[PDB]
Amino acid sequence: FNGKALNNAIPGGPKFEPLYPFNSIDRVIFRVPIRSEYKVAFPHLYNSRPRSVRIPWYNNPVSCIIQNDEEYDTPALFFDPSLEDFAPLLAEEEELILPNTKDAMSLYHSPFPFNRTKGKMVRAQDVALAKKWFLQHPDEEYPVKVKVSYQKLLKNYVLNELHPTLPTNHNKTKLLKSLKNTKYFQQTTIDWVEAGLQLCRQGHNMLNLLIHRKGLTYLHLDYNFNLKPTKTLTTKERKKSRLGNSFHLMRELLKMMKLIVDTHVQFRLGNVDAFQLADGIHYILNHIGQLTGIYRYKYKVMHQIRACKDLKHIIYYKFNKNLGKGPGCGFWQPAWRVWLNFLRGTIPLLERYIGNLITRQFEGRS
Amino acid sequence: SYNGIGLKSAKGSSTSGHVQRSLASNNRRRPQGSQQQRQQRQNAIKKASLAVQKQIETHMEKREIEVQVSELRDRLEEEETLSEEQIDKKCEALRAKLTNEWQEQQRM
Amino acid sequence: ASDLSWSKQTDTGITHFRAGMTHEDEKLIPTIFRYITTWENEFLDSQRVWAEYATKRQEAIQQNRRLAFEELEGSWDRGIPRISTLFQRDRHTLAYDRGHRIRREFKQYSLERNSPFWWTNSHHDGKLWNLNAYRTDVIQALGGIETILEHTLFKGTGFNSWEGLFWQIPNRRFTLWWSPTINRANVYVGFLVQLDLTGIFLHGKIPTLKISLIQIFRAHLWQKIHESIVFDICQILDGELDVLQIESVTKETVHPRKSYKMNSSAADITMESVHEWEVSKPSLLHETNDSFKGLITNKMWFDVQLRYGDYDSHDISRYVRAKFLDYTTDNVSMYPSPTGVMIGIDLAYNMYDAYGNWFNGLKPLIQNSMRTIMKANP
Amino acid sequence: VLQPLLPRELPKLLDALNKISKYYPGVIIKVEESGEHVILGNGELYMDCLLYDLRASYAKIEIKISDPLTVFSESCSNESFASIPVSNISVAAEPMDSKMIQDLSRPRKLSKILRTEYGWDSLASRNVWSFYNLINDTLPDEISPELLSKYKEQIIQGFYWAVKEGPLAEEPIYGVQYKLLSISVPSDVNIDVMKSQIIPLMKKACYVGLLTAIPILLEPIYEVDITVHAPLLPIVEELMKKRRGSRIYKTIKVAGTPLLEVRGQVPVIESAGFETDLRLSTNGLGMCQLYFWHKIWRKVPGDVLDKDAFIPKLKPAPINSLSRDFVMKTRRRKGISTGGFMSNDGPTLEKYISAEL
Amino acid sequence: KIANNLKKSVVDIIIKSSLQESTFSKFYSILSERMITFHRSWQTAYNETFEQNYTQDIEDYETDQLRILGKFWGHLISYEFLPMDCLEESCPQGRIFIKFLFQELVNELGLDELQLRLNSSKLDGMFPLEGDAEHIRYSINFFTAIGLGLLTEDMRSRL
RNA sequence: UAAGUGAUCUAGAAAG
RNA sequence: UUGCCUUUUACCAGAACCAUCCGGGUGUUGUCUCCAUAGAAACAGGUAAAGCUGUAUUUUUU
Ligand SMILES: O=P(O)(O)O[C@H]1[C@H](OP(=O)(O)O)[C@@H](OP(=O)(O)O)[C@H](OP(=O)(O)O)[C@@H](OP(=O)(O)O)[C@H]1OP(=O)(O)O
Ligand SMILES: [Mg+2]
Secondary structure, eight states, X not given: OHHHHHTOOOTTSOOOOOSOOOOOTTTOOOSSOOOHHHHHHSHHHHSSSOOSOOOOOXXXXXXXXXXXXXXXXXXXXXXXXXXXXXXXXXXXXXXXXXXXXXXXXXXXXXXXXXXXXXXXXXXTTTOOTTHHHHXXXXXXXXXXXXXXXXXXXXXXXHHHHHSOOOOOSSOOOOHHXXXXXXXXXXXXXXXXXXXXXXXXXXXXXXXXXXXXXXXXXXXXXXXXXXXXXXXXXXXXXXXXHOOOTTHHHHHHHHHXXXXXXXXXXXXXXXXXXXXXXXXXXXXXXXXXXXXXXXXXXXXXXXXXXXXXXXXXXXXHHHHSXXXXXXXOOOOOHXXXXXXXXXXXXXXXXXXXXXXXXXXXXXXXXX | OOSSOSOSOHHHHTSOOOEEEOSSHHHHHSSTTTTHHHHHHHHHHTOOOOHHHHHHHHHHHHHHHXXXXXXXXXXXXXXXXXXXXXXXXXXXXXXXXXXXXXXXXXXX | OOOHHHHTTSOOOOOEEEOOSOOSSOOOOOOSGGGSOXXXXXXXXXXXXXHHHHHHHHHHHHHTOOOOTTTSTTGGGOTTTTGGGGSSTTHHHHTTOOSHHHHHHXXXXXXXXXXXXXXXXXXXXXXXXXXXHHHHHHHHHTTHHHHHHHHTTHHHHOOSOGGGGOOOOHHHHHHHHTHHHHSOSSOSSOOEEEOTTSOOEEESOOHHHHHHHHHHTOSSHHHHHHHHHHHHHHHHHHHTTTTTTEEEEEEXXXXXXXXTOOSOOOOXXXXXXXSOOOOOOSEEXXXXXXXXXXXXXXXXXXXXXOBXXXXXXXXXXXXXXXXXXXXXXXXXXXXXXXXXXXXXEETTTTEEEEEEOOOTTTHHHHHHHHHHHHHOOO | OEEESSGGGHHHHHHHHHHHHHHOSSOBOOBOTTSOBOOBOSSHHHHHHHHHHIIIIIOOOOEEEOOOOOOOEEEESSOOSOOOOOOOOEEEEEEOOHXXXXXXXXXXXXXXXXXXXXXXXXXXXXXXOOOOOOEXXXXXXXXXXOSSSSOOHHHHHHHHHHHHSOTTTSOOBOSEEEEEEEOOOOSSOXXXXXXXXXXXXXXXXXXXXXXXXXXXXXXXXXXEEEOOBGGGHHHHHHHHHHSSSOEEEEOOOOTTSSBOOEEXXXXXXXXXXXXXXXXXXXXXXXOEEEEOOSOOOEEOSSOSSOSSOOOOSSSOOOSTTHHHHHHHHHHHHHTOSOSSSOOOOOOOSTHHHHHHO | OXXXXXXXXXXXXXXXXXXXXSSOOHHHHHHHHHHHHHOHHHHHHHHHXXXXXXXXXXXXXXXXXXXXXXXXXXXXXXXXXOOOOOOOOOOSSHHHHHHHHHHHHHHHTOHHHHHHHHHHSOOTTTSOOSOTTTTHHHHHHHHHHSSOOSHHHHHHHHO
């Protein structure tokens, strides 16, 4: 935040758009070459004219000595000092250490995920397997592009941290809950693949219904949600058929979905191995740009795409340390998380957009 | 930006905004050590090059006498000389003996 | 880019270099500034050469001769004004053009297209620069002529040599020339689409390029090419029917789509044999050591696989192999035998290649065939 | 050194400063002649905290700030060779004994005895003292005969002014004796007009003495405390090398843990972002500290009163050029010097005896 | 990151590039200075390149190119070499290169100053004091071609 | 008492 | 407020404001489910088990 607020980017981390648009050489004595690192450390002192600047932490030296294996309670890494019938407490407890306490100590020193032995669940989505890599420092001498990726990720993270989006509480009537309340929905336990395929079928029927309703039957939807015109279009017809950024965006989301669901189908239809599936899914998520022109219609999706790219760059180079190059990495989690959050963002937007669209289809335009 | 030296930000510039340190910086870091012989020669070219002293000497001399006086004071105040006459007498003696010796010095 | 806060106070020695106009795969493009004689040099130089001229003029006078440009060569291109101005085709006309600089200056106030080089005149001072050096150096610096054309669609035209080239319509040409580079396989977000009737996968729309390519393959040209090649192959087989023990060379009539359909492929020619053939394991054309396993075939198939490469996907062999063992081992568009042959032609580079199983003594015929067709298919 | 960003909001800062003073006891807040206020922090972090408090919750004003200067202190190396008097008073000086310095940083007969215990000094010099802050010895010859030498309270205050604002750059005097040698008091004079003369004249005398004493400038030194993991020990050494004038005195190995709580000494000038830099280099395994309770001043290397002196404008000045740079720069800061080009030097007649003859 | 092997080669290349141009550039001079300053190895390289030039390559050049080279060397000489100068017999183009160099030096430093500087140095081939039988005549003669003093003085000394 | 650690923006669709 | 640009969408990325959305917490009610399903046991003690205290020679009591 401080780096942001002063444009004093710490080179391992992010660099932002600037927050804004005596002291002569004759006077001062440049003995210490005053670095940027200091300008964020003691922001109010080394950096004159601070604005909107936070105060960081300051700290104690950590000597958490970790054990390698096959022993307990030993000074290893360090040096040693210069120089009426009753037993003590907890008698008849001969073994000082239990077989788990070697590990328990380790556990105790761990961070927030494992630290503790109870918790509330979180959504797979809500777990950030990838945040902990790029929040901590980049390991050693990755290619420039990966370093850039890291920086990009941090820039995102800081932004997210910085503009707290406090969720409004009064609206505790969810969409699904609302739907559940009515009679016209029932509920079943369906296989996720079944749900997918059914939703492709449903989505396809929806979009075709919409298009035909509009009148422009000459726009043939392919089952792969890749829209194209059947005939050469008369200018009038062409004008009519320029479907907007709502319909196309809907199509693109279904295209996205159709891909991953199709891959699952393939996997489960006996074609491809689970590793192959995982790689497939990963490929899809990291190449949503290249597999479905989502960016075309809603270009802010470039951020999402960029994020995915960054993740890939990060992941691969933690996935391919000793392992060589190649395509066979899976691990689709963080990218998947990105896409989920993009959908979260857009669900409102598409409810509005497609809402208005179908309203126009039904009610005339105002 | 980095150390008062990066581009404000990469937006605008229309470029990476990648910021190398030059390696002529080592030349600008040590040009005095590299071209020490330039100034050294110059320095070499110009490298060859009473009242106050008198005053100091005088101070030392009078000061010495005053030290004698002090010593007298010490001897008196410590070892059996509760009276003022003893002090004054001692001072007088110092003046006479001291300024005698110093008169001798003057003569020489 | 020196320390901006200090630099305002005093001049610094330049400490930190920022990257100006950068690029991925950074070929060090030379500037223009290095190829222009900096003014101070030009002026000291001018003083020298004019002094020399003066001296030689005196010599000429003494000797009573015309001081010809044979003697002053070398200094011809130097000095201000340029020595060339002494012996241009009409000094004795330009002698009476006094007040020239001022007139050039005041063209500013009396014209629409105010000249960019108001400050000098070539008649009076000569070429005050020369950037052929810049041209030459730049071409040398982009891997030479040789290497630039790998970016271009030069390979597509199929000249003997590039050296034999010499003797919104104008920019269309430009776009088409860098077709391969501009329509590139490796690309950021570009969504893949194919142009109509073709295998020209545009990685994100370009209008001009699309217009070009479509005009290039007007009259279903791609399809025609595909069918033509198939016909040729059939003819060849007919010719050499009894040599390779073939019962019947039938063409499996597919939709017109097949020519350019890329997700699937029905086989173009189906090859009914007389006896069982014992085809080799799948391999490329130029892969000589074809392994004859105990597997046999009563029937082969020949498929063509037209493609239009980029500056990134410009190997064909790999692609054709991929195509072969993609469509075989795919449960859409099955061939009558899983054993067969597949040809593919990179139309953008004239890089034929083929992969698949091999009947004994067949390979040479196919190699020769491809060589012939490429040399001259209509 | 604070200045408010807008002169319109100057009174607020003054009020703010007052509040800060009230709240932060360990802050000498000298209002410098220019208006540019000085704030003396204990160290870096404390100073920052002070500034934060000021700039956020008391002032709420944007504030120009000087890079962290250090309170230097003028002094001498040898005894003053000359004894040039002062007029419209000749004060000699010499370096206080290094044991006696320390003794000072924490009944005439008794004091005299003590002095003789400290440095075995003469009873004459023992009797005539009136020290502060360093030592004002009333040690001419006529002073015991004279009672013009009496009523030296005013004189002592003048001496206090000298101590406060030294000759070099209004930098306080430290570790220096002051042997008086004469006084230019004529017969008939009023004690108001005579005393008033002697006060600034005393300052002049002191300055003269300093000049003739081979004056040296003294920077302070933080005593350092660096706990680090043993494996990252030579890194610290390297860093110290990178810093100027930094000494490392004992690497006492802290028992039962990898920490080598090494004491050190960084000059207060060279120290800036030291903690932070150390932390960075050490990968956050080096929770370091700086502090200044010993009052262990030391000579800045290089000699004051040089013409050419140094090379750089931007780069840190060399070791042997340093003192001069500090002096001239500090004079500029304090507004004593005239423009860019100037010099610290003697304001006395005889052409300075033709520059030491 | 060029290793000590080719540093000399790099310097040679740089020199050749300089030669290719119409005239001597401050550019090349500054580059030379920077590299020289950097590491002792590059100083060595520049030196040895100089040796190569006056030894063997020098006589192949044309008066323009040669002149440029001389100028370049003069600029370097004025600061970042010692005036070590391995220099009657050899006067094809080398001597005129020398002329150019001297001209550059004089233009930069100054005449009297230059003399002082050289006086400080050894200067065996340029300024011999031991007569060697009408041999100083040669050097003296050559330096009279350009505006230089002290040749007369030298001859007086020698008789 | 004499070298080279490091900061690396973009990015494509519609309609005109 | 900048950037790409130049015509808008779509956008670049910062700001200040605000909203939407994906979710979360509790607490209380109610339902749904799976298990259940007793209208009386102490007192006198004994048996066994759980919670505290107990094991004079000067200031508490020898
Ligand atoms: O950096 P990007 O433009 O996103 O391209 C990357 C990158 O290729 P380049 O370095 O050639 O650009 C990766 O290569 P490495 O940096 O890892 O060597 C490669 O990753 P793999 O090496 O793991 O294949 C990956 O390819 P893929 O998507 O097949 O994983 C590929 O992405 P694109 O194929 O989308 O260009
Ligand atoms: Mg309009």
